[PDB]
Ligand binder design. Structure first.
Ligand SMILES: *[C@@H]1O[C@H](CO)[C@@H](O)[C@H](O)[C@H]1NC(C)=O
Ligand SMILES: *[C@@H]1O[C@H](CO)[C@@H](O)[C@H](O)[C@H]1NC(C)=O
Ligand SMILES: *[C@@H]1O[C@H](CO)[C@@H](O)[C@H](O)[C@H]1NC(C)=O
Ligand SMILES: [Ca+2]
Ligand SMILES: [Ca+2]
Ligand code: NA
Ligand code: NA
Ligand code: NA
Ligand code: NA
Length: 245
């Protein structure tokens, strides 16, 4: 029903020295100013910034996680961080307020040995939230290739539908999900060249430009709160507008 037709010019919010990382805002209807950051491909700490002025000021508080993260594909939904427990096929839900956590295993997902979903960012699992669901993008350990998406029930942190896109990870740079549609970039992370209607179970044509920069892309995520794409590009924290049709 609602497909992206183009991506606007990016805004640079901050530049830092860490080539790879993520920056994340709350996605739910909450009026939350906080920004969460991780750096590098593994660790057990998150930097919490009160708001965007604090981000620009370098003023944060460390959050110690219950399990090490891997990668740059985490997401925040309803005051919980959803992330990949490094070296396992386990995803973690960590509630920021109560500091409790729950775990979910995806048994037929690649998760080690550099058999990545997105090689460009060493991503095994890309967690995402949009208007239509809470999602995990991953790659099949049955065939070593196919991009799969799990639809979760947020109330039980469990999978309710497994979607096989049939698209080979070798052709994917990165991806995001918006209004129920998976969008996958080319291997250079410059254009979106594949899309899939997740709940309808079918591929849909998509071919549109994403960005002109060639800097390495660590993270790419749609936030339904503001309908922007958030990215981390060679240490540059960027936001892009998106145009729907
Ligand atoms: C922003 O950074 C400057 C540089 O040290 C500092 O003086 C100022 O207090 C910071 N703003 C805060 C902490 O709100
Ligand atoms: C969010 O979390 C709160 C507290 O854990 C809970 O009451 C609520 O049902 C959750 N979901 C939404 C959509 O707020
Ligand atoms: C997904 O589809 C591919 C291509 O048809 C197939 O090889 C694979 O077994 C399917 N399921 C999984 C979990 O990969
Ligand atoms: Ca491989
Ligand atoms: Ca190859
Ligand atoms: Na930082
Ligand atoms: Na381009
Ligand atoms: Na690139
Ligand atoms: Na992504």
């Amino acid at each position: 029903e609602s497909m992206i037709t183009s991506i606007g010019n990016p805004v640079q919010v901050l530049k830092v020295t860490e080539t790879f990382g993520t920056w994340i805002r709350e996605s739910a209807n909450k009026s939350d100013d906080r920004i969460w950051v991780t750096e590098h491909f593994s660790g057990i700490m998150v930097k919490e910034f009160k708001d965007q002025p604090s981000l620009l000021n370098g003023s944060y508080t460390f959050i110690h996680l219950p399990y090490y993260f891997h990668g740059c594909g985490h997401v925040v939904y309803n005051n919980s961080l959803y992330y990949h427990k490094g070296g396992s096929n386990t995803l973690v839900r960590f509630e920021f307020g109560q500091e409790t956590s729950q775990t979910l295993k995806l048994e037929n997902a690649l998760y080690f040995d550099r058999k990545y979903l997105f090689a460009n960012s060493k991503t095994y699992f890309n967690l995402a939230v949009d208007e239509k669901g809470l999602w995990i993008i991953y790659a099949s350990s049955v065939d070593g290739s196919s991009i799969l998406v799990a639809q979760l029930d947020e109330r039980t942190f469990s999978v309710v539908q497994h979607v096989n896109t049939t698209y080979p990870k070798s052709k994917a740079g990165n991806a995001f999900i918006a209004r129920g549609i998976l969008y996958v970039t080319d291997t250079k992370d410059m254009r979106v060249t594949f899309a899939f209607d997740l709940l309808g179970g079918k591929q849909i044509n998509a071919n549109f430009d994403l960005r002109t920069s060639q800097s390495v892309l660590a993270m790419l995520a749609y936030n339904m709160r503001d309908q922007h794409l958030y990215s981390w590009e060679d240490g540059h924290l960027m936001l892009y507008p998106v145009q729907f049709l």
